[model samples]
Target chain A: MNKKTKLIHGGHTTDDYTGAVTTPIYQTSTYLQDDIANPTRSSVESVIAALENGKHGFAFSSGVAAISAVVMLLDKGDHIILNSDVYGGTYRALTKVFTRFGIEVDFVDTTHTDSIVQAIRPTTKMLFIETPSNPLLRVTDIKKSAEIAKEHGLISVVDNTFMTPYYQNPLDLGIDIVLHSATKYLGGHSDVVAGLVATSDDKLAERLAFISNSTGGILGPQDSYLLVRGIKTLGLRMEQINRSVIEIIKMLQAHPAVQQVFHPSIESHLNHDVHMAQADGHTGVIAFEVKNTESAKQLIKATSYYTLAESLGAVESLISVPALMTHASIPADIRAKEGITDGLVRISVGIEDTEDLVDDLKQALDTL
Target chain B: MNKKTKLIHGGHTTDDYTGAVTTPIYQTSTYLQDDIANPTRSSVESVIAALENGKHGFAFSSGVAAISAVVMLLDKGDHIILNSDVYGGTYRALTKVFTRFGIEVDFVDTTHTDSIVQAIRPTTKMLFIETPSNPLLRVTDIKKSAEIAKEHGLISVVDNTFMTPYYQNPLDLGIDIVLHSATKYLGGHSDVVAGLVATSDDKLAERLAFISNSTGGILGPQDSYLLVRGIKTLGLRMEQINRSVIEIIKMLQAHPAVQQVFHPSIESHLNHDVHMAQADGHTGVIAFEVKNTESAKQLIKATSYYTLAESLGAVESLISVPALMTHASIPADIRAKEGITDGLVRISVGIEDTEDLVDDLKQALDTL
Candidate 1:
């Protein structure tokens, strides 16, 4: 089936018992045992065993839940290598929280394969990367990174939130595990929040499943149903958003007020060649720096159609100033070191009409 | 506000943000920061610190997640006490899971407060109890149990699923932490799976919040919104279910085929006085035994209106055979020790018409 078909039909079929087109929300914390004297142990055991064996699929409440499930494989004193310009939540997780628990993270420029290879400490057990990176749209080579991880006996984890399974399958690229903040692209509408982790290795699958179930981070049945429903039109939404983003990138690159357009679809982007080498298509995220922080704020305030907000991967376009909005967690020095400037603006291009979006952006830029 | 009023209006106000009647589902993985360098540091940090300070109003994907969060606070090699006739999921967690991770569980007859006190070991760090225990509505003295936990310096954790926060407030009785398989009572319609832990203590609340967020077992914004909605009408639904249960209990107690009744409201129950001392009202669960296993199976099969399924805390009545359904996880020896008989049947009274529920039970019993 194509991506669109798969989104609608991938995880379920009509309920055999009810003939319902969509999977019934199990919305249950406990399932019944057929016989108390001989308890039905297979359901949970099979799930855990599958995860350990590594051909496992589990759902969580949000993207962070999915990420944390994978992180459970790490110990208190273990270290991990993360893309320097990763999602703010992930950065906060590793630096602020996990650091207190004794886990160490080495942030490295993952877009350059050599940088990642050089940054892997002997104690590092996992390599976590996001591509194309949120807000910045910096893409990393999954296949090359996976090879490096295998050479060092480390697990390869990819946050495939921007480029979803439909657009790019990281596991197929030799990555050990694939994670999604299904709240965005997978759930095309801004109505549900969920996270998913799928792996092909049986042993790793078992551990992930065990930790997921044992810790009770499993996604609710209602959210699962919503995710299944939203994913049905993933292809349609992405196609529209992708086309619109390309147009927006072109416009932003030519804008006199814009300093630098960071979208991979733009030829001037540093990682355009590497990004195209790994991903089938550039995603619908465009990041740029305006002339000044005040001008950036003026543009954001002037845009009537684009909702100023955090988060991406939804059908509606959103504009935000990363310095004050999304990446506000990193200290000023660290953020500056990572190249997140005060004048930086991130735009998640939506499936809206290209003409309407472009006109909206033009009017907003007029204010600057 | 009364329980009914609180369920509809507690923890939220429509006029605060807008007069939208219902709270907006944040449906976001991360909230936006004010600027590029903010990371929403103060907001996220305050949320983290609030958890540490013990104002416990957080949600998880399921009851197990809530349970695991509490249990995670225990150290390796720490011992914990649980009700012998607890939910099968809890039993599985303690025995099949936690034991492997180094935590030991001592299951005892929690109905008798003395049994709990006797079972505490030097390594015992917590007492986990379920009042009006699952399958069989055996009530325990929450106030007395809290006292025992306090004297021993053990944290008192109560699973207030059966009775819910409306019928009983564990914290009001001096219990340290109160939990709910919110999927049941709080999300009364069986539309969402969730769990909640509320505490008055500032310190324990912080740890619970840290583990909850760090573990990423946090509930999604949509599910949180659904649960908040479900809880709004909790008082009305509980009242309806409570009335229906009283009628059903009377019929079962008088049935000639019944060997024994397990409901706290009945004057003949062993712990009736203690139950009344601790709880404001009897919960919507009733259990009874027939002549034998065959009779029990016959009665279950004869039910028409009630669902023969797992899980409770919904608007529809459900009937289950403990030997064949809910408590099937307990070992045969343990089942016998806990007086869980092959002939026993459990009912989760729902918000059905009282007369119709009584009639349905009568017809089902006629088969026995």
Candidate 2:
């Protein structure tokens, strides 16, 4: 099946018992054991095995919980290398929470092959990367990074949020784990928040499954149903988002108020070739800097249509100032060093009429 | 407000916000910082402070997550005492998981005050109890347990699932912590799974709040909304369930196939006085044993309306064999020693028509 077809039919089909078109929300904390003599351990083990074998899929409450379960595979005292410009939440979790538990993280510019090799410490157990990095739109060579990780016996974990499985499959590139903040594109309506990790490795999958069950971060069944329902239109939404965002990027690049545009689809982008080599399409996200922080504020405030929000990957167009909104967790000094300026605004283009979005952006830019 | 009124209006009110009549689901993974300079640490610290001050309530995914956060307050090597007849899931967590990390749990028969004291090690940091215990409905002396715990400088943790906050407020009796498997009664619709913990102690509340945020087993906004919705009608449902369950218990007691009934509300129950003393009302659960395993199977299979499901505390009636369902985690020999037999059937009475339930039970018993 194509992306659109798979999105609609990938996880669940009609219920065998009821013939319901959609998956029934198993909004239950515990399932019934057929007989009193059947151990719960065996029931849970069977469920986990089914999940690992792709016979069934499990859900979790949020993206963080899904990612946390995936990260739990790392032993205490092991080191991990992350993309220098990863999501602020993941970065904060790694530096603050995981560090307290003896897990070490090194942030490096993985855009350069040499930099990845240089950043690898003897203790490093994983290479975690986010492609078309958040805010910066810098792309890392996934295959190359995966090779280096393999050479060092380090697990390769990729956040496939920006370019979802529809555009890019990290596991296909020899990446050991692929994580998604399903709250975004997969749940296009912005109504549900969820996360998922898909991996082919049995050992790591087992660990992830165990941590997910033990830590109790699994997504509520109702939310899981919502996610699965939303996913049925993933292809339709992404295709529209991809096309609309390209036009939005062009307009932003041409605008006088815009100092710079960071979008992988643009020919001027540094990692355009590398991004094209891996991902089948450029995602809907476009980050750009205005003339000044005041101009950026004026644009954000003047925008009547585009909502000022914190999250991305939703169906509705969202405007955010990374310095004060989404990436506010990144220290100002660190952000500046990474080329993320105070005037930078990250725009998550939606599937709205292209002309309407352009008109709103034009009016907002005029105010600036 | 009275119990019903309190269930509807406690913790939050429409007047506190926009008069929306219901609390808004704050379905956000990250709350925006007030400004760029606001540290992530302060955001979490302020949240913890708000919880300690009883200004707000936070949510988590499951009972285990809630309990684990409470447990995290203890230092490594801290000793804890638990009721031997506690939920098997909790027992496994305390013994297999937490004990592996250096915390020790000593299970005791907490029904006797002297037994609790005798089991308490000198290093014991906490005493965990579940009154009107699972399946058997064994009630412990909460006041006596609290007195002994305080006298020995130990925190008292109570699993208030059987007797919800509507029936028993542990904080009112000086218990340090109260936890609930909100999957049951709190989410009356059986459409959401959640866990909640509330405490009156500012210091312990602070620690729990911190661990909750740091560990991130936080409940999704949708499930939180479901819990809020369910809690509003908790008193009404409990009243209906209580009335129905009592009749069901009477019917089961008179049945020829039944050997004994284990319901706290029954006069013949061993813990009847203590159960009445600790709780405002008897819970909806009733347990009875058939003549043998064959008769139990016949009775269970003969039921048409009552579902043989694992969980309890929903608006829908459910029947299960505990030695086969909820307590299946415990070894057969151990479960038998604990008085859980193959013929034991646990009934979670719902708000269904009392006569319908009785009819179903009678027909099922006739089959046996």
Candidate 3:
């Protein structure tokens, strides 16, 4: 079957006992052992991991929880490096929580090998990388970074939330771990807060499963079922959203108040070669800088189609100022240094009519 | 309205625009400020908190995640006194995860004030109490323990999964935090893995909200909605399960193979006054021991309705041996010390017909 067909028909889509076509929401804690995954929390897990072509996968309560489980792999006093332009929740978890336990984290622009190389220390145990990073959509070399981490004996991780399995497979690129806050495109309908982690190695999968189960940060069966249902249309959503993103990008570029656009970062930029090698396509989320902070705020507030909010990767368009709304936790100095300026407006394009989406953007930009 | 009415009528029950009676599952990662909790991730949080008569509530990925967030209130070298019979997940998290971060935990039978006092060192920062604890339904003095915690300048936290808010309100009894594995009784169906924490203190609520959001273990909207829906039937389920439990307890006592029942401990043993003081009623879950280990195994396997599984507080009957299934992680010596013996079988009496339940138990025990 094709990727699109598998998206709809894959995983435990049918119930063995009930003959239900869709995986029933096993809103249960303990299943009678064999049907244990009956809350078959694995409905989503299996679907996602199978799509990633990884050996194993575990779903978490949230993206950050999934990342937290991955980071829990490192003991106290261990150092890890991550993308500087990371989602705010990841930044907060590491700086506020993990650092208290002596896990030192250094954020560097993974787009440039020099920055990552300079930040890497002997104590660095893992490399937490994000290609086509949050808000900015900066592309990083997934394959090169994975190879680099291998040489340094570091467990390589990737946040594939933006690309999804339809667009890329990091494990195929030799990345050891793939993580995502599946709430975005995977759930598709702007519902469900979820996280996923996939790994190729059997030993790594075992350790991750143990941590997920033992830590008890697992996704509920209802959300797992919803997520699996959402996965069925993942290919359909991605195709529509991607096309809409391209059209919207053109509209933003034509807008007088739209001072700069970041969508071009992936298609033709620093890691374009590396991105093309692994990522089959780009995501719908497009981040741009308006004339100024005031204009960006004005545009967000004025938009009818784009709902001003804190998250991206949903069916409905969500717009926010990264510096104030989403990336506020990054701190003023660090955020500015990472190009998350006050004027930056990150927009997650939805599966809406292309003409309507562009028209909404044009009017919103006009208000600026 | 009464508790039953409130359970169903509570939370965001309708779409403002569509007027949909049932709250839509906002399976969204983040909500627009205006659309906050539209099928809000916090609906169950708001519902459970209001039921507990608390000002603020936070939902997490799991009960352990909620417990872990509460423990995050302490720092390195901080001491915690917890009920010795805490749910195995909570025990495992503290000993295995939090202890690694320098938070020292000492398990004590909180039913005795002396044990709580003896375990409280100078560095003690929190009190983690579980009433009608896992496997063995040992009820603790929620009121007295909270008073003591306040006297010692410690935060008093309660795991309220067994006797839900309909039966007891710990916050009203001066407890600082009330936590629940919503996956159990509150999510009455054998589905949706979730945890909830509620507190009246505005400052504590603010801190908890920060920790919950920052740490990224917040409950997904889908699970939250399911939890809310399950909670709607709480009063009805509780009444039915209680009646069924009374019937099952009688059958267990009449059988020669049935050695002892701990739930009846609330009526006949130590902490009887304390148990009755705050607890309005007995829970649906009942734990008992049979003749021996082999008999226990044989009985659990022979049961037709009582499922040999791990969780409790659901509509479906779930049975498990603590040593092998539920409390497997707790060291054997500790399990023995806590009266969680090798021959014990924990039964979560569901909302099934009382006659059917008793007959099933009779058949299983007769085989043993």
Q: Write the per-residue lDDT of candidate 2 for residues B1-368, one digit (tens) a residue.
A: 46665565455434344667755555443333333311212222222223223322446787777776677667556788887787656876666555644677888888787898898777789998998888788888888888998899999988888877778767667777877777888777776667777766778866766566556676766666667677778889988888888788888888888888998888878778988887778788888988777887788788877877877887788888887766677788897898898899888888889899899999989986
lDDT of 3 by residue, B1-368 (tens): 78777777765566787878877766455544763133466567778778998988888878878888898888777899998766567877888777777789998988787789888899999998888777677778888898889999999999888898888899999999998988788888876778888899999988887777666777777677777778888999898988888788888888988887878334675677777778777787787888677988888777889887777787888887877776677698888887878888888888889999999999989997
TM-score of A-chain in each prediction?
A: 0.90, 0.91, 0.93
In CAPRI terms, model 1 is classed as acceptable
TM-score, ranked from best to worst: 3, 2, 1
Could you give candidate 1's per-residue lDDT for residues B186-292 as a string of tens digits?
A: 78887676778878788897888777766677676556666666666777888888889788878888889987888888898878998788776768778888988
TM-score for each model: 0.79, 0.82, 0.87
In model 2, how large is the Cα lDDT of residue A255? Answer: 86
Listed per model in order, the count of residue pairs whose N, CA or C atoms clash below 3 Å is: 37, 5, 11
lDDT of 1 at B8: 46
Highest TM-score among the candidates is held by which one?
3
Better of 1 and 2 by TM-score: 2
What does candidate 1 score on TM? 0.79
- Docking quality tier of model 2: acceptable
| Best model number under DockQ | 3
What range of 10 consecutive residues in model 2 chain A has the weakest lDDT sum?
A37-46
